[PDB]
Design an enzyme around this catalytic site. Structure first.
Site, PDB file in Angstrom:
ATOM      1  N   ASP B   8      34.690  25.684  23.204  1.00 40.71           N
ATOM      2  CA  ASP B   8      35.075  25.762  24.127  1.00 40.71           C
ATOM      3  C   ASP B   8      34.654  27.809  23.975  1.00 40.71           C
ATOM      4  OD1 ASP B   8      37.065  27.309  23.108  1.00 40.71           O
ATOM      5  OD2 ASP B   8      38.621  26.104  24.906  1.00 40.71           O
ATOM      6  N   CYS B  65      37.495  26.411  19.517  1.00 38.73           N
ATOM      7  CA  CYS B  65      37.846  26.581  20.329  1.00 38.73           C
ATOM      8  C   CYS B  65      39.148  28.501  19.604  1.00 38.73           C
ATOM      9  CB  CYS B  65      38.997  25.623  20.871  1.00 38.73           C
ATOM     10  SG  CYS B  65      40.362  24.749  20.390  1.00 38.73           S
ATOM     11  N   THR B  67      42.605  28.062  18.631  1.00 46.09           N
ATOM     12  CA  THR B  67      43.413  28.012  17.253  1.00 46.09           C
ATOM     13  C   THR B  67      42.729  26.827  16.505  1.00 46.09           C
ATOM     14  OG1 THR B  67      44.416  26.165  18.513  1.00 46.09           O
ATOM     15  CG2 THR B  67      45.365  28.558  18.364  1.00 46.09           C
ATOM     16  N   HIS B  98      40.404  13.228   0.875  1.00 46.66           N
ATOM     17  CA  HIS B  98      41.483  12.748   1.348  1.00 46.66           C
ATOM     18  C   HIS B  98      41.728  11.731   2.058  1.00 46.66           C
ATOM     19  CE1 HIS B  98      45.439  14.575  -1.584  1.00 46.66           C
ATOM     20  NE2 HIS B  98      43.590  14.044  -2.328  1.00 46.66           N
ATOM     21  N   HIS B 133      43.353   6.248  -0.381  1.00 41.55           N
ATOM     22  CA  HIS B 133      42.455   7.612   0.365  1.00 41.55           C
ATOM     23  C   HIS B 133      42.194   6.546   1.252  1.00 41.55           C
ATOM     24  CE1 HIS B 133      43.394  10.570  -3.192  1.00 41.55           C
ATOM     25  NE2 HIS B 133      44.217  11.358  -2.034  1.00 41.55           N
TER      26      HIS B 133
HETATM   27  O1  RB5 Z   1      46.834  14.193   4.480  1.00 44.63           O
HETATM   28  C1  RB5 Z   1      47.756  13.390   3.470  1.00 44.63           C
HETATM   29  C2  RB5 Z   1      48.982  14.332   2.448  1.00 44.63           C
HETATM   30  O2  RB5 Z   1      48.454  15.556   1.798  1.00 44.63           O
HETATM   31  C3  RB5 Z   1      49.351  13.593   1.104  1.00 44.63           C
HETATM   32  O3  RB5 Z   1      50.911  13.667   0.821  1.00 44.63           O
HETATM   33  C4  RB5 Z   1      49.209  13.708  -0.192  1.00 44.63           C
HETATM   34  O4  RB5 Z   1      47.868  12.697  -0.262  1.00 44.63           O
HETATM   35  C5  RB5 Z   1      49.448  13.097  -0.825  1.00 44.63           C
HETATM   36  O5  RB5 Z   1      49.558  12.471  -2.239  1.00 44.63           O
HETATM   37  O1  RB5 Z   2      43.247  24.883  22.104  1.00 43.00           O
HETATM   38  C1  RB5 Z   2      42.371  25.318  23.104  1.00 43.00           C
HETATM   39  C2  RB5 Z   2      42.144  27.140  22.740  1.00 43.00           C
HETATM   40  O2  RB5 Z   2      43.209  28.022  22.153  1.00 43.00           O
HETATM   41  C3  RB5 Z   2      41.477  27.740  24.120  1.00 43.00           C
HETATM   42  O3  RB5 Z   2      40.458  28.926  23.421  1.00 43.00           O
HETATM   43  C4  RB5 Z   2      42.235  28.443  24.365  1.00 43.00           C
HETATM   44  O4  RB5 Z   2      42.785  28.419  25.832  1.00 43.00           O
HETATM   45  C5  RB5 Z   2      41.020  29.771  25.600  1.00 43.00           C
HETATM   46  O5  RB5 Z   2      42.064  30.038  26.974  1.00 43.00           O
END
Ligand code: RB5
Ligand code: RB5
Lengths: 148, 148
Positions: B8, B65, B67, B98, B133
């Site tokens: 965005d 975006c 965040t 993973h 995984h």
């Molecule tokens: O995205 C999932 C997490 O990282 C799990 O805790 C790990 O795979 C731990 O082995």
């Molecule tokens: O999660 C989306 C972002 O935070 C957007 O770029 C903001 O809302 C910008 O206003």
């Protein structure tokens, strides 16, 4: 308000710490496990939490694994769930204000305990801002409707 | 491989920097917009990149975006998509090893340019580890099948 909490074995110790923090602050906590250090599959627990939020048995959820990534991708598969992987308080606040996140995701291997409590504190207190953010949240709903 | 990118207005400047980085390294880049600083809705651009990855028109996507949160939540609504919001190289690496992530999500208001390039470098080079995984990625698939 009732907070659902869940983790795999990668988020289990941080889960116990946050459950403890939440109670001390007077939230009602429902713990969906996991309940030990045994190897488990993060999607099962992401689902339990996300379904509890979807069905109103919890008002919001917190999901924890090593990084937060797997359990929140899984939680986000559920229609009406908005799971936010946050590694600082700024992301936590915005996830409430902008995205109206109803699940917070954390990674026990990425954020230390006190950083994680700051994040949880921020997230519980932040408020959705509506307006154009409701419009954008509707457009997330349109994706869900398309693939439903 | 071919990389789809989208943003965005909150992710537009980082997107231009990442596109430039990726070309320099010999990737083929499909830019899905947005194409300026005008206010836009992150789900539209999340969807475009996510559907390109699903249709096999891109091999992997990068979505940006403020965040990373909104766009990654929206990207995650599409079945077969696994969008990882990363704020460091460690998360980026695990998301590939993973979670077999096929979309990287970034927040231009959270990570500075050179950190974001470190994360993209790490993410592009990491490889899925399979094994347990894969099992867990299939259980993500079971959630998508349940709500399909
Ligand atoms: O995205 C999932 C997490 O990282 C799990 O805790 C790990 O795979 C731990 O082995
Ligand atoms: O999660 C989306 C972002 O935070 C957007 O770029 C903001 O809302 C910008 O206003």
């Amino acid at each position: 308000m009732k907070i659902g909490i869940g983790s795999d074995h990668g988020g289990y110790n941080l889960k116990r710490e946050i459950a403890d923090f939440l109670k001390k602050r007077g939230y009602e906590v429902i713990d969906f496990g996991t309940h030990g250090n045994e190897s488990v599959d993060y999607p099962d627990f992401g689902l339990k939490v996300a379904e509890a939020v979807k069905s109103g048995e919890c008002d919001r959820g917190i999901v924890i694994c090593g990084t937060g990534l797997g359990i929140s991708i899984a939680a986000n598969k559920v229609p009406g769930i908005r799971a936010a992987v946050c590694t600082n308080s700024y992301m936590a606040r915005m996830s409430r204000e902008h995205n109206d996140a109803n699940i917070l995701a954390l990674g026990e291997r990425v954020v230390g305990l006190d950083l994680a409590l700051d994040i949880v504190d921020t997230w519980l207190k932040a408020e959705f801002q509506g307006g154009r953010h409701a419009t954008r949240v509707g457009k997330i709903g349109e994706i869900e409707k398309k693939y439903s």
